[PDB]
Amino acid sequence: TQELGANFENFIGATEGFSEIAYQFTSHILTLGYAVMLAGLLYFILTIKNVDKKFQMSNILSAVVMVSAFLLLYAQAQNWTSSFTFNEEVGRYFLDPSGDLFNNGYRYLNWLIDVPMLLFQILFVVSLTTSKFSSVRNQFWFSGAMMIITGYIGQFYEVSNLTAFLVWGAISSAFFFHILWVMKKVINEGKEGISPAGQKILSNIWILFLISWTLYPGAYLMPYLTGVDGFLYSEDGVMARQLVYTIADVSSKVIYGVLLGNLAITLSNK
Ligand code: NA
């Protein structure tokens, strides 16, 4: 019975190990991830003056999100390289008992912190019509927290009890769907009575939001999307999962923030 290998990354690292390519690709994509957040941080700080005061809480939230994402993705990246070490005899990277083992906590903490801020920030750019700010905020914050909490619980069972992993994942997905429903309503209200240039940006924000947020459950399920004997149930699934999480992080935090800032500017023209 495998004792060293809590999550799929540790499981693969303790059994099959990672090829040089899988190890280096994953390290590099994780590094690109935190590097983009640092660049984003400087961007959101420097451009804060480009929007009217009434919208600046959004730019502020983007900056705070970047701080958390840079730190925690930096920590994630160091955790990757510290956790797996090369064996000369076999020629692959294996889980290093003298390391601390791969830990998903960094990313899940980042989500817990950032999800509520990302959801909140749009409410400082668009105006609602018939909904209340407090009601939308509360719905986003409760569902967002429950989504990440239930997903975190699920992740614990990814190796030891795939049933529990999938059931907690489905519970999390229920909260996710409710978030999508609320955000779609917010975007539709925000489009009312603004310029068509702003409306177009909001349409793009919705598509970005829908796609980028759905990448997360996709990455969560990735190693199983081809079966337990499938091609992804391997280092390939680890590489794909980490790639997709990184694409999702950049899109959902940085690109989303840039679009919101551009919306604010278009509202800053009429
Ligand atoms: Na290493």
UniProtKB/TrEMBL annotation:
User: Where in or outside the cell is it found?
Assistant: Membrane
Protein species of origin: Dokdonia eikasta
Membrane spanning stretches: 25-46, 58-77, 108-128, 140-157, 163-183, 204-223, 243-265
Q: What is its main location?
A: membrane
For whether the record's keyword set contains Glycoprotein, the answer is no
Ordered alphabetically, the record's keywords are: Membrane, Transmembrane, Transmembrane helix
The UniProt gene name for this protein comes to: NaR
- UniProt-listed InterPro entries: Arc/bac/fun_rhodopsins
How does this protein sit in the membrane? Multi-pass membrane protein
Q: What is this protein called?
A: Sodium pumping rhodopsin
Q: Does the keyword Transmembrane helix apply?
A: yes
Which Gene Ontology cellular component annotation is one that this UniProt entry carries? Answer: membrane
Q: Which family does it belong to?
A: Belongs to the archaeal/bacterial/fungal opsin family.
